[PDB]
Amino acid sequence: KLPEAYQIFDPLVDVLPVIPLFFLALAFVWQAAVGFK
Amino acid sequence: MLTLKIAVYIVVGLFISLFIFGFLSSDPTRNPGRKD
Amino acid sequence: NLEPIFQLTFLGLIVLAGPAVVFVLAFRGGDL
Amino acid sequence: ELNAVDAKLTTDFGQKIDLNNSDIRDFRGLRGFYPNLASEIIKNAPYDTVEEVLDIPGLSETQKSRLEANLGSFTVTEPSIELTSGDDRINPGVY
Amino acid sequence: GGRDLPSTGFAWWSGNARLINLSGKLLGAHVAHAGLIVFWAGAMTLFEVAHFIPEKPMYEQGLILLPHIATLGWGVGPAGEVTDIFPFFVVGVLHLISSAVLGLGGIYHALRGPEVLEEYSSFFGYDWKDKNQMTNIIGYHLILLGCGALLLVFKAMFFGGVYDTWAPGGGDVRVITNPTLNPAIIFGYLLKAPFGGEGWIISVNNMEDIIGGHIWIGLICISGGIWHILTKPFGWARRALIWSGEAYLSYSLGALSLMGFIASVFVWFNNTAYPSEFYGPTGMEASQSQAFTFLVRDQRLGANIASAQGPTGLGKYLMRSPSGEIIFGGETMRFWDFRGPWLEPLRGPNGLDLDKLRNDIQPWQVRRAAEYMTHAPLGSLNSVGGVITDVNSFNYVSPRAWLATSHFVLGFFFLVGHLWHAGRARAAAAGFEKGIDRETEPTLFMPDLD
Amino acid sequence: KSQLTYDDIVNTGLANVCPEISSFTRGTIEVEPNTKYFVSDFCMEPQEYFVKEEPVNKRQKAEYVKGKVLTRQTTSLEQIRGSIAVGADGTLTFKEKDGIDFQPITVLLPGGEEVPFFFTVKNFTGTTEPGFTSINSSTDFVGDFNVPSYRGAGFLDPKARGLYTGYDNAVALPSAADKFRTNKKETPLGKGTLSLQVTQVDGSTGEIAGIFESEQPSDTDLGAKEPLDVKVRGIFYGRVDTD
Amino acid sequence: ASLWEQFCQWVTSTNNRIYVGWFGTLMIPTLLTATTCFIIAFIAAPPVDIDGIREPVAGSLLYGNNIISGAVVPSSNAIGLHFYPIWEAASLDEWLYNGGPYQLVVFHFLIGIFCYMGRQWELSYRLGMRPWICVAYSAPVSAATAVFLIYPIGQGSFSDGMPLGISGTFNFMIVFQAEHNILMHPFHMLGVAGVFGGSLFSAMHGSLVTSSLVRETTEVESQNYGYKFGQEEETYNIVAAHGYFGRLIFQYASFNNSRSLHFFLGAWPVIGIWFTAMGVSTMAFNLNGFNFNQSILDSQGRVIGTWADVLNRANIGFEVMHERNAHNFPLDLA
Amino acid sequence: SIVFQIALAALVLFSFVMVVGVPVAYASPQNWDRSKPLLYLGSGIWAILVIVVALLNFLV
Amino acid sequence: IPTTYSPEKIAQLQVYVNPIAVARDGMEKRLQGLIADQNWVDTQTYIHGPLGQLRRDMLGLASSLLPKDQDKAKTLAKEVFGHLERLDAAAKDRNGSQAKIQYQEALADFDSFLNLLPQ
Ligand code: CLA
Ligand code: CLA
Ligand code: CLA
Ligand code: CLA
Ligand code: CLA
Ligand SMILES: CC1=C(/C=C/C(C)=C/C=C/C(C)=C/C=C/C=C(C)/C=C/C=C(C)/C=C/C2=C(C)CCCC2(C)C)C(C)(C)CCC1
Ligand SMILES: CC1=C(/C=C/C(C)=C/C=C/C(C)=C/C=C/C=C(C)/C=C/C=C(C)/C=C/C2=C(C)CCCC2(C)C)C(C)(C)CCC1
Ligand SMILES: CCCCCCCCCCCCO[C@@H]1O[C@H](CO)[C@@H](O[C@H]2O[C@H](CO)[C@@H](O)[C@H](O)[C@H]2O)[C@H](O)[C@H]1O
Ligand code: OEX
Ligand SMILES: [Ca+2]
Ligand SMILES: [Cl-]
Ligand SMILES: [Cl-]
Q1: What spacing in Å lies between the alpha carbon of H3 and ligand 6's midpoint?
Q2: Suppose E14 and one of E10, F52, F87, F224 were both cysteines; which one would form an S-S bond, judging by CB atoms 3.0 to 4.6 Å apart?
Q3: Which residues contact E401 (CB under 8 A, 6 or more apart)?
Q4: How far apart are CA E225 and CA A35, in angstroms?
Q5: Pocket test for ligand 8, best of A30, A31, A36 (most atoms within 8 A of CB)
Q6: Is-contact G52 G149, C-beta < 8 A?
Q7: Is D15 left (phi over 0), alpha (psi -120 to 50) or beta?
Q8: CA–CA dist E424, E422 (Å, integer)
């Protein structure tokens, strides 16, 4: 696992990799805020 | 079999060479629109 | 335990961060 | 008309362990047989009678005693090459 | 540049097409996307490290990045046992931090930086028609890729070596001291049939060939970089190709499709650059292992596996390949081209050797065959291992399966993208990408077919 | 063969070729009167196949016809271990013990008939004449061998009929199911005759080579039809352990 | 001017009754080769030892097959993925017995269909069209490549390619389901949506256009004669079709833009077929459909069955019987 | 050792602040006079944070 | 850091000592004669076969050994493996003289390794 000093942020490393999915979603959010100009 | 192999190799090489040199022969200009 | 709780807190903060950026830009009049 | 294996199942081969036709899996019910003693018995087949299973060359005292204990479960029939060819007494395609 | 349909002619769902002529904004998009890539590398590595049980093999734990680091010789020793977990952690961290930096730069260029770069600098400003500048950028990047290939070479030679699954005494991290610079071998790999038993470049089976081919790749790429910096495209290239941003994109898409197909095949078949220690057995390896496992078991039971004929009359355990070699029987006859470090000690000049099979089989080989047979790259989409008719209690899908499937899918869709963009680039260059002009509809000036 | 590696041999067909000794070889292998010598890597490479066609007329010569092999370079016995015992009078007795001592082979005949047969040397016992105090160019081991059924008793025919597995009847035709003779499978143990003429002895290395001719039955397809007679001509090699 | 230029002008000529083109210069020879061999083999090929166990399978009409049962049989499992051209067989009889015709036909066919797709692009370019009909065609091509090339590669043998026959196709399908549970694979579900929906949308579009035809004929003659080839006037009333459909479901679910409608008609089946092609191509690497066997347990721990367990029973029944003599060991890995 | 945890949590907090602010700062030309130096400052601080963590990795 | 041999620590070394002793016996008996007979195929098969666990076993010796004898044993095992790799290289190229040289190198380094073995 993560070396011992870092297992306070194990639950953050657990969710970090899916972030680019949220970027792809954020593109559509931004386009929705601009009314899909 | 060896005669067959050589003959097929010649035939295939000629067809591939045709296709390659045709697409090298200024193919983008063979269109009904712009020729730049 | 608390691993799903902590995980969901991180996930929710992340989920808000992007839309929060977009909403702030839209409301304060930044370029979009 | 039964082919040859079904006619074998008509005989004692279908009622107990045949020392000359049974597969090695069929020795598993005899505690202490599978795999070592069972392999030894199949290797030193055929047997004219059941008792010569005790005359297997090179046998050991505990294996001897196990054979004497389980003599009752054994029979000897004529070796049918259908059950013997291809080392099917070791692996007849059953898993 | 406009940011809507009336001022760009592109809808929102094709909005990135608006960037085609905004060189600064396009650079920002590229740098931010590179940040996304590096971010995923770092985050996925950290996730895998966190979710890593270092005494359970990597391939049993859904890991695709850690095997890449292990194969490079970091954090592993003999038989691939994980010595130090810290190098995996450092690779992940470094990618995460540099990803932050790349994202910041991409955001700067995409959102505040100069819209176009051509009136700010001749060096970074580019025009898609500027054949000299396009080849300059090809040259800079070719030099960089040659540097990366030589980086692999340096790691294998002078920085601890790489994992050699073919190492005598057992697979181990070893330093490659004699890479094959011999051009005959290096470039005859490229001439081998892409079919069974030859396996065009998939068949590279020793780290010496891999490292030497990478030395050659480094030299070729660097020389091509210098060649393209100092020259402009020749007449034949100018006449055959389309010279536009979308055309260059389409060319790269074709290249990417080819590479994706090749990588899927590579991970499916090759157990040298993808050691089975980290990636698990190939399908061929698992089939051969099953045949070997039952040969060994039935031999211990007393079966004379040399002379045992199966139900069809072919040998149950051993048979001949169509070229005469002694091979495992059963359906695995199709996999007789397989070579693996656990099986080659039993292979003689004629194929499998009866004497070695009868008195050279080691307990570690038996264990390895059992392991590989039970980790055959078969599994369900919800990660239930084994043949599809098995029940739910074995949570396993081979990393080779994940990698091969994903890369075949990506290769195909990038072939589709290549077709889309090549067709569009041609039509736009000829000026009919927006439909048939009613006045000059070409078919109307064409004679009737019959 | 020669002295290369599996890398040099693979996909060449050399793996199916029985090793050969030399040309300047007319040695002899002296043998004790009554001791037995192991034979290490006995190889038989078939080269010619003939099937005795069966005329419909009667009573007329059948005329072996040359067939052509449809299976590929998968026709050779190799790595066979055996023994040679020297009789009290001087007779030489070759006994096949094991190895890769069978290959299924299919030959095509003129007329389109395909003949599978189980080419084998299994349990071959062969003898020479008495008065042999050596193995030389006149050593002719003539003997017999067994020919197991081509298909094992675990084989299933296209309607899943078999001997120790499968249906015992024609299930696709419920009202005629027991009507077919092929509902009963058999695997009779056939007999073949082999002759190994030794032609070349390298007594220092122990290698003997020679010609062979074998006569055996073909596949009956679990007794569906009568066996043809297949004659195989070829070459053989082996190493005789003198010590 | 030059002989080469004249030849180029001929091959790329839009006046040829059948366009040839540079892609055509490969398509035509390979496709004719595949066709000639296919016809000859389907009619007259001798049996092929597909499973590599010397158990030849009769595929041709002359060996007792009808049209439904006939096939060009895939090459032998003994061959695996090896290249088996005619000149690598000691005799034509050997080549036939090991299934060489299958390899010849398949390789030429695949080259031909890729060249067909290139040729579609080429002709659209010569006619000044937009270029993407070939993109739609890349869906059937992808599926064909999956079943004839990708799946055999992943499985390690051309013996596991789809046979070139009707019953052979069914056999391929049944075994594929037994080994991969393709029905429970979402990409096949998407392919089914693609084809069911494509047929739905074909019927819907055809029926709405036919319903809204402008009166130009009498009740005696075919209404088809109301359309004259090469008219610009629209032959149907799209606004009336939109009125009907937006009242059938609701207004905002109906297209009123013919361009968007036809884009949707193109895109739906094409995307579905791409997905099902990718499904077959990834099950080639044994990433199979969902496995919910024994997913539902009662409180004690006994399995409660679902329809997935019944499906698995069917799959096992198919699996244990397929290639009944080919397996020596307990797991069907290869 | 608790100083290492404190530095780690500080780096994560400042990374969150950066993730929020940076796009807004680059996407507000009007308030670019006072958000251009902050950008600089923040980046430096974030850089410093990373450095501290790295050193503390070998101190802990 | 006991830094002293004991009855119980020796038994935990034995589980790796047995395979290594068998391997060294084989290396003295069979591998030498395979090299002498100019038999490269069987040489490669032997060094990848019965030896195919040598690195694991001998590193288990090294890492589970005395604090003084840990790094020394690791280095000696590495030298043995390097000579084994050169042996494989020499056998692949049919280099008899180089093969015998590397064999003597590997055997001497193996003897040096087993020298620092208690009892
Ligand atoms: C090459 C890419 C790749 C590969 C081979 C893998 C492989 C794996 N991942 Mg992973 N991952 C990836 C990318 C990849 N990942 C990316 C980009 C992310 C960021 C989101 C992640 C984040 C991630 C997490 C959090 C986890 C994994 C896990 C795993 C393992 C379990 C796989 C699984 O069950 O998923 C299930 C399969 C699916 C959900 C099906 C996905 C199908 C997609 C949608 C296909 C899209 C089709 C097509 C491209 C659509 C566009 C075409 C268009 C024209 C229509 C496995 C080894 C798990 C693991 O075991 O960790 C150790 C795990 O927990 N991954
Ligand atoms: C990798 C994905 C990617 C990238 C790098 C880009 C990049 C870009 N797009 Mg875009 N786009 C995408 C996907 C992407 N796109 C997708 C999937 C769609 C379909 C929905 C679109 C549809 C689209 C349209 C319609 C347009 C663009 C445009 C643009 C350009 C201008 C951006 C802009 O001004 O808007 C501003 C948006 C904001 C200011 C919102 C905030 C965005 C920031 C960067 C969020 C970053 C958050 C991050 C976590 C913070 C980290 C900072 C640091 C601490 C590391 C730009 C270079 C425009 C263009 O072409 O310009 C001429 C345009 O008109 N795109
Ligand atoms: C391929 C990526 C790329 C490219 C082509 C550019 C290009 C450009 N940038 Mg940019 N940038 C990038 C990434 C990139 N950037 C990233 C990742 C960041 C975040 C740190 C930035 C942040 C940034 C800012 C704040 C500014 C620019 C500016 C510029 C423009 C002026 C360049 C110049 O003269 O400065 C001088 C160039 C040098 C002094 C050379 C230094 C080379 C680097 C910094 C050292 C490392 C070299 C490395 C070893 C090489 C390989 C990299 C390695 C990672 C593989 C120019 C068009 C400026 C501008 O737009 O002017 C109006 C400007 O304001 N960039
Ligand atoms: C990504 C890297 C890259 C890219 C994008 C380019 C791009 C280009 N190069 Mg190139 N080059 C590179 C790397 C690269 N090069 C390197 C590393 C070297 C050093 C060896 C060279 C040396 C080089 C020379 C000498 C020339 C170019 C030229 C060109 C231009 C036209 C060539 C062409 O039509 O391509 C495609 C190739 C053809 C159309 C010829 C047909 C080639 C065969 C028939 C294709 C068959 C491949 C086969 C199907 C695939 C199987 C794989 C394998 C078995 C072969 C073009 C812009 C030309 C130029 O314009 O000079 C300035 C030129 O003469 N380059
Ligand atoms: C490096 C690769 C690359 C690059 C730089 C581009 C760039 C571009 N493409 Mg292109 N394309 C590519 C690959 C690429 N493409 C591939 C592989 C395909 C085959 C599918 C295509 C097919 C394609 C079409 C049909 C079109 C473009 C178009 C464009 C232009 C605008 C596109 C846009 O705004 O995106 C906007 C982004 C979106 C609308 C979001 C799309 C989301 C996809 C469909 C699903 C994502 C699935 C993914 C796997 C994640 C799964 C999520 C899961 C968790 C549910 C732009 C210049 C347009 C064009 O021609 O401009 C002139 C256009 O019509 N491309
Ligand atoms: C432009 C644009 C776009 C895009 C964007 C992008 C693409 C981006 C990005 C970006 C990126 C790419 C980023 C990033 C980041 C990173 C960060 C921010 C970091 C960090 C850090 C940290 C904090 C870490 C920590 C740690 C450590 C140190 C180790 C251990 C673990 C942990 C995790 C704790 C979009 C589409 C939206 C639209 C609009 C336009
Ligand atoms: C590293 C390595 C190696 C090596 C490798 C190498 C050495 C390579 C290479 C390679 C190369 C060197 C390549 C290439 C390529 C090419 C291509 C891919 C091409 C092409 C083409 C094209 C695309 C063209 C097109 C066209 C035509 C056809 C005509 C018209 C015009 C055009 C352009 C359209 C080895 C294996 C040893 C081992 C492993 C690792
Ligand atoms: C539970 C209740 C139902 C939940 C419904 C969830 C789905 C709702 C729609 C999702 C949002 C779509 O977002 C919608 O995009 C359209 C494009 O036509 C844009 O439409 C709007 O654009 C801008 C807003 O900035 C306005 O000036 C414009 O007059 C208006 O048309 C808006 O961005 C939003 O109205
Ligand atoms: O070959 Mn036609 O299918 Ca593919 O899975 Mn293994 O192999 Mn056979 O057994 Mn099931
Ligand atoms: Ca965790
Ligand atoms: Cl079947
Ligand atoms: Cl099998």
Answers
A1: 25
A2: E10
A3: E377, E378, E379, G285, G286, G287
A4: 45
A5: A36
A6: no
A7: alpha
A8: 5
- Both tokens assigned to G14: 């839009």
Ligand 6 neighbour A6 (Cβ under 6 A): yes
SS3 content of chain B, % helix, strand, coil (to 5): 70, 0, 30
Tokens representing A10 are 């194990």
End-to-end CA distance of chain A: 47
Residue with tokens 């025919």, as numbered in its chain: F157
For ligand 1, pick from E13, E40, E44 the residue to mutate: most ligand atoms within 8 Å of CB: E44
- Does any domain span residue D90? no
Q: How far apart are CA G169 and CA G318, in angstroms?
A: 15
Query: Looking at the domain that runs over G3-184, which CATH code has it been given?
Result: 1.20.85.10
Residues sharing a CB contact under 8 Å with residue G257, sequence separation 6 or more, in sequence order: none
Name A11's Cβ contacts closer than 8 Å, sequence gap at least 6. C3, C6, C7, C10
**CA atoms of F187 and F191, how far apart (whole Å):** 13
How far E265 CA sits from the closest chain G CA (Å)? 8
- AA identity, residue G291: N
Task: Report the nearest atom of ligand 9 relative to the CA of G327.
Answer: 9
Rounded to 5 degrees, φ, ψ at F28 are -145, 150
C-alpha span between E317 and E329 (Å, rounded):
5
Sort out which chain A residues have CB atoms less than 8 A from C7's CB and list them. Answer: 11-12, 14-15
Q: What is the DSSP string of E10-26?
A: --GGGGGGGGTT-HHHH
> Tokens for H5?
């945890």
Among all ligands shown, which has an atom nearest to the Cα of E61? 1
Residue nearest (by alpha carbon) to ligand 7 atom 13: E190
Domain range enclosing H24: 1-60
User: In this structure, what token pair is assigned to residue E126?
Assistant: 């580019």
Q: In DSSP terms, which residues pair with F141 in a beta bridge?
A: F196
Q: Is residue D59 included in any domain, yes or no? A: yes
**What's the number of CA atoms in the CB half-sphere (13 Å) around residue I71?**
2
Please give the structure tokens belonging to residue E70: 């292990």
DSSP class of residue G90 equals S
* Eight-class DSSP state of E386: S
Cβ proximity of G315 and G288 under 8 Å: no
Give the three-state DSSP class for F234.
strand
Nearest to E283 among G286, G288, G290 (CB): G286
I69-92 and I96-115 helices, crossing angle to 10°: 160
The torsion angle over the Cα atoms of residues B18, B23, B25 and B29, rounded to 10 degrees, is 150
Report how far residue E330's alpha carbon sits from residue E310's, in angstroms, rounded to the nearest whole number: 9
Residues 6+ away with beta carbon under 8 Å from G262: none
Max Cα distance, chain D (Å): 45
**A23 CB within 6 A, ligand 8:** no
**Burial environment of residue F31 by CB neighbours within 10 A (0 to 12, 13 to 18, 19 or more):** buried
Return the half-sphere exposure (C-beta side, CA atoms, 13 A cut-off) of residue G309.
11
Helix, strand or coil, per DSSP, at residue E51:
coil
Phi, psi of F141 (to 5 degrees): -85, 100
Q: Which two tokens stand for residue D35?
A: 């795999």
Q: Which residues between 1 and 36 in chain B have a beta carbon less than 8 angstroms from any beta carbon of chain G?
A: 1-2, 4-5, 8, 11, 15-16, 18-19, 21-23, 25, 27, 30-33
**How far apart (Å, rounded) are the C-alpha atoms in residues D56 and E302?**
15
Q: What is the 3-state secondary structure (H, E, C) of F170-230?
A: CCCCHHHHHHCHHHCCCCCCEEEEEEEEEEEEECCCCEEEEEEEEEEECCCCCCCCCCCEE
Q: Which regions of E54-104 does DSSP assign to beta strands (E)?
A: none
Q: Name the residue range of residue D68's domain.
A: 1-85
DSSP letter, residue F232: E
